[PDB]
Amino acid sequence: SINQKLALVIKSGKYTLGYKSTVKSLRQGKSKLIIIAANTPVLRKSELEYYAMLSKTKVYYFQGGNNELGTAVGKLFRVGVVSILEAGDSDILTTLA
Amino acid sequence: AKRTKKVGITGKYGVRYGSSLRRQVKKLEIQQHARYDCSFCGKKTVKRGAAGIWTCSCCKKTVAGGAYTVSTAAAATVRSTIRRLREMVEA
Amino acid sequence: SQVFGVARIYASFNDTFVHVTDLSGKETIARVTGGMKVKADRDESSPYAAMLAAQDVAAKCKEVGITAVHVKIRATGGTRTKTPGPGGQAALRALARSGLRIGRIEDVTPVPSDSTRKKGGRRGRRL
Amino acid sequence: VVDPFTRKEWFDIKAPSTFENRNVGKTLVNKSTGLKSASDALKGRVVEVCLADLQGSEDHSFRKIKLRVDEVQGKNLLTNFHGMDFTTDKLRSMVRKWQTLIEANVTVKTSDDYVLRIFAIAFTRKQANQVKRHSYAQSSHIRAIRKVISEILTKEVQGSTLAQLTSKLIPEVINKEIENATKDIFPLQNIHVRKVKLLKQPKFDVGALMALHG
Amino acid sequence: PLGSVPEGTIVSNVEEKPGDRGALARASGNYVIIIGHNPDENKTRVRLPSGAKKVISSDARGVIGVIAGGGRVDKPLLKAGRAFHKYRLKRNSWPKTRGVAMNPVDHPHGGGNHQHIGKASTISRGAVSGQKAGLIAARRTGLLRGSQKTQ
Amino acid sequence: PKKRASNGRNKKGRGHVKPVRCVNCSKSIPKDKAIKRMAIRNIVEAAAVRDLSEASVYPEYALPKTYNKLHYCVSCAIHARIVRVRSREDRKNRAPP
Amino acid sequence: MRAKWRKKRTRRLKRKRRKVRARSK
RNA sequence: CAAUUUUU
RNA sequence: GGUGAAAUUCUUGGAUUUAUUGAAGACUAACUACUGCGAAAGCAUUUGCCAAGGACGUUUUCAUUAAUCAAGAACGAAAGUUAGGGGAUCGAAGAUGAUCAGAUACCGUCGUAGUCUUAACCAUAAACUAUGCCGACUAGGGAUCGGGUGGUGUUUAUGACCCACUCGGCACCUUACGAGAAAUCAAAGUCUUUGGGUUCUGGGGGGAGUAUGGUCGCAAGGCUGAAACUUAAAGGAAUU
Ligand SMILES: [Zn+2]
Ligand SMILES: [Zn+2]
């Protein structure tokens, strides 16, 4: 279950919410594992992975959208995308697919 | 808080026009301009502009949905009628 | 050597009929009914009526050139007794006697997944 | 008035090739006059034939076949494959009380542009030194094998177009293969495929005409 | 083009003749269904939102999906004005005075010490213009629904 | 009073089962109650199988047998199934004959 | 007499006793 | 098929 | 056509039939049982998602956190309502054909409401196991589901089974010491050898779940609920 997996990230996984921070994390090429939402605007969607061709990070498309990623991470607002710049104790970054 | 007890929504008429009628308009006109949640924005700020229009205040993207609600009873069966159908005409 | 027909017996109540046709199963031939072998209408399912009908069905198929038939009995089917009629063994036996070979025969009674509520009602056929 | 029986063509039929000898009956249609001649008359019919003549097998008196007919040519007409269902006796000579029944379909987009639903059926016996009567499995093995039913017939299919999958159905080697997979879970009685019905003929298909004779 | 779509696609804005730019099933909400294709002489078997079947060619146009504006007629107006503001951009068809309390001259029904029409209401198509009021050439009156696809 | 110990129809602790259909008078009855006695004979006459085996191609071919089952009502049960009554002490028995 | 039709009498000769509270009063 | 009344 | 027997209705404009397709919506056969699951009503064709519940396992944990409940509350078959969608089959009202003395009853052929779905309703059914909820113990006997523990056990380590045991089920059979009015009962037992707790209900039958009063409903109706008068049984079980 992936919804077992990403709930464990909040312990010590260095992650970041937001979009510009998601981009700025992806700017240095140090961050991995972009997580997106289903009902994002698709013109916003493409330049996430178009950078991510160049940093080679996996972008797992999440089967839910924006409004149901919020309770799926813990916070109470409509969090669009999620970058996991470090997941020091985890299982996502290897065992996905 | 809860100002009056039963009529509520269409209390603005008063005592005229009937009451079998204005408890059917009560059931509809609550739906007519209550703020729905259009799905391609992740918010709930879409409301009436005209009988057939809906318009989200953020994201500025106006659907052409139903008359009084955002999607009718017959609208959710047509989008699965062709999604019944769009597979086996290909495969 | 034998040419193969299919009889498709309608074995049911108040009447019984049958028609030989090609092994494909569309070009129908010689459909005698219960009302053509008796004018009583109260015994068209009786085996005396299917006795007169079956030998006429083969003789009207004899000049056609029918030699053997893959007969197919079927009951009233649908939402009734699911039982072959009284003349069901009367059209089969008389056709075997009237000079016509039989082979590869079973029934085609349509078994449903029991639904589309039967007539009569809740409290049954009172009678 | 006319006695219209002297108006038909005392015509034949033909079987597909991947079998034994193929003259499998004769029919009666029409005359090819003007106003939509009897050449392109039928083009859609089915041949409700059992396998008992097409292979000579006596034990295979069940599994009636239907037959796609497409062409006519030169006092003959050549035939394509449709599917199979059991006779209505051989089902209910097996489903008695005090057992369970498993049925689990997976339709499959095959190699060329067909698609076709396929079924299965299952039966449970008690391996003697028994005392019970009702012979159940634990209702998660039912949940377990009816999904692995749904990938046994995703290996032989999706490849090797059905004009030699019929060469795999007439020895029932897929029904032999079900005994291989369910050999450790819960064992089973004799397993059959029991149905296949077709729904995606793409086109007129003169290219597959010459395959089904020789 | 409806010949290029398969069975049962509930469609709209379909056309009675090829190349005419829109004629059929474009009112506020209703649809139309296709029930097949006659292959030879490529016409088809189409219903209609009142139940009368119709035959139209292959290459007629058509958009899938029903028209927006669903469920509109069933809320009451409650106001004379929202009917007057309804008939603002259509006609001077509103209001409709009744021809029974009318004068005996301006309508074939009025007059008398009471208000009775006296003659029948259903007058035929054999009647000709200037007198067909009442009811136009029909058979079944009375309270019972005429439904489509009877048993 | 009481007349049957396992009172109505083989049923404790299940409330409602589903109804099924009689075949002799189209009656709906609760599924556990009425009767389920089978019917399997043949498809022949008073045998006439010598008449069959002379008139059989692919010789004699089956001994063709049948299957059917019956659901009754309560009224046409003892009107057709020739039992009509049971004695007082033999109400308790569960004999197949 | 099933007591359904003892009960069908008394549950519609009640309202005709009870619909005197709108015409008269 | 239909069969009712026969009277502290 | 349909019945005991006939009449509606349909049909040379191709009926009833045979094949080929295709659609509509309902519904889940044959497996289906002395069996499962849920507080109850109810629950059956698959796969996935969401949460929940039972039973057993343990040498984990907290320490009376507990049993029942007036007032107040969530759920509650079908029918019915109000408003849209859908409306195959059945089918109150009605139409119509036999039936007889009458048949607007039974039987026949049709057919709107309802049956199906969404939102608001209604709180009633033989909602019956006519057996409130909990705790102790008291005879056996064989099955059966789910968990668990063993056996020099067959089959192919494995999973189902065979046997022995135990837990909790749902039931069955024998028997009575016991219980009662009997029928019957493992609970309806451990009750004049009368007291384990704990909620409710009944005092002859009628009037009647009626009148007035209140409350809940949009209405049908639901809850609470007499009196006047009337009169010896109504009644439960069992033998002939
Ligand atoms: Zn928006
Ligand atoms: Zn019946």
Side-chain angles (χ1 to χ4, degrees), chain E residues 7 31 35 74 144-145 147-150:
Chain E
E7 187 69 35
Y31 52 88
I35 315 173
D74 287 334
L144 189 62
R145 187 175 70 189
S147 298
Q148 186 55 253
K149 192 185 175 186
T150 186

Side-chain angles (χ1 to χ4, degrees), chain C residues 118 124-125, chain F residues 21-27 71-73:
Chain C
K118 203 189 270 82
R125 183 179 175 87
Chain F
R21 287 291 172 183
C22 170
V23 75
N24 202 1
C25 64
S26 298
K27 177 65 171 64
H71 299 287
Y72 284 174
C73 68

Side-chain angles (χ1 to χ4, degrees), chain D residues 46 68 95-101 126-127 129-132 134 136 138 143 146 183-186:
Chain D
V46 290
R68 300 280 92 184
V95 281
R96 290 179 180 175
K97 293 177 66 64
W98 292 286
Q99 63 182 357
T100 185
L101 269 301
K126 292 300 289 179
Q127 180 182 2
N129 72 4
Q130 297 298 326
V131 297
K132 290 187 177 69
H134 51 280
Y136 290 159
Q138 292 289 322
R143 296 285 304 276
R146 81 187 297 168
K183 194 167 182 289
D184 202 7
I185 302 300
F186 190 78

Side-chain angles (χ1 to χ4, degrees), chain D residues 15-33:
Chain D
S17 66
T18 61
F19 292 107
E20 196 63 29
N21 53 4
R22 296 167 61 246
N23 293 116
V24 289
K26 292 177 77 68
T27 187
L28 285 81
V29 182
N30 269 316
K31 298 287 103 172
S32 294
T33 182

Side-chain angles (χ1 to χ4, degrees), chain F residues 46-83:
Chain F
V49 185
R50 179 259 179 88
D51 299 329
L52 297 176
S53 179
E54 61 89 21
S56 297
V57 69
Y58 296 169
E60 82 255 8
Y61 158 73
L63 197 151
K65 290 177 70 175
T66 187
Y67 286 93
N68 191 358
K69 64 169 67 182
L70 298 177
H71 299 287
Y72 284 174
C73 68
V74 286
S75 66
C76 296
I78 66 102
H79 185 74
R81 183 167 66 93
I82 305 299
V83 45

Side-chain angles (χ1 to χ4, degrees), chain D residues 82-98:
Chain D
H82 189 201
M84 64 91 212
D85 54 352
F86 284 169
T87 56
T88 190
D89 195 0
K90 191 60 181 175
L91 281 82
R92 56 193 65 252
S93 179
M94 297 184 76
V95 281
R96 290 179 180 175
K97 293 177 66 64
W98 292 286

Side-chain angles (χ1 to χ4, degrees), chain D residues 32-161:
Chain D
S32 294
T33 182
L35 195 145
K36 196 260 188 293
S37 68
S39 65
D40 291 331
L42 63 161
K43 263 67 183 176
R45 290 184 180 177
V46 290
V47 177
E48 188 177 2
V49 65
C50 176
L51 192 143
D53 58 354
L54 186 55
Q55 292 294 105
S57 177
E58 56 89 19
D59 58 354
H60 290 86
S61 64
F62 57 92
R63 63 173 68 248
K64 291 183 287 183
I65 315 297
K66 297 182 184 292
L67 283 178
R68 300 280 92 184
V69 60
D70 296 335
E71 297 286 328
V72 304
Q73 49 186 358
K75 301 296 186 290
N76 193 1
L77 86 178
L78 203 280
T79 303
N80 294 318
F81 182 79
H82 189 201
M84 64 91 212
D85 54 352
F86 284 169
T87 56
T88 190
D89 195 0
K90 191 60 181 175
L91 281 82
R92 56 193 65 252
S93 179
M94 297 184 76
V95 281
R96 290 179 180 175
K97 293 177 66 64
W98 292 286
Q99 63 182 357
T100 185
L101 269 301
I102 297 168
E103 53 184 1
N105 52 359
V106 47
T107 184
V108 49
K109 181 69 176 65
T110 182
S111 66
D112 52 351
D113 50 357
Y114 296 172
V115 75
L116 68 167
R117 185 171 292 117
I118 48 95
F119 284 176
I121 199 167
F123 296 101
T124 57
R125 87 286 188 270
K126 292 300 289 179
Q127 180 182 2
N129 72 4
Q130 297 298 326
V131 297
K132 290 187 177 69
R133 181 71 179 270
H134 51 280
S135 73
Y136 290 159
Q138 292 289 322
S139 297
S140 70
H141 302 87
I142 286 96
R143 296 285 304 276
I145 66 174
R146 81 187 297 168
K147 69 100 174 179
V148 310
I149 291 296
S150 68
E151 75 259 9
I152 294 165
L153 215 281
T154 70
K155 293 186 262 76
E156 180 68 31
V157 77
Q158 52 88 34
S160 182
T161 303

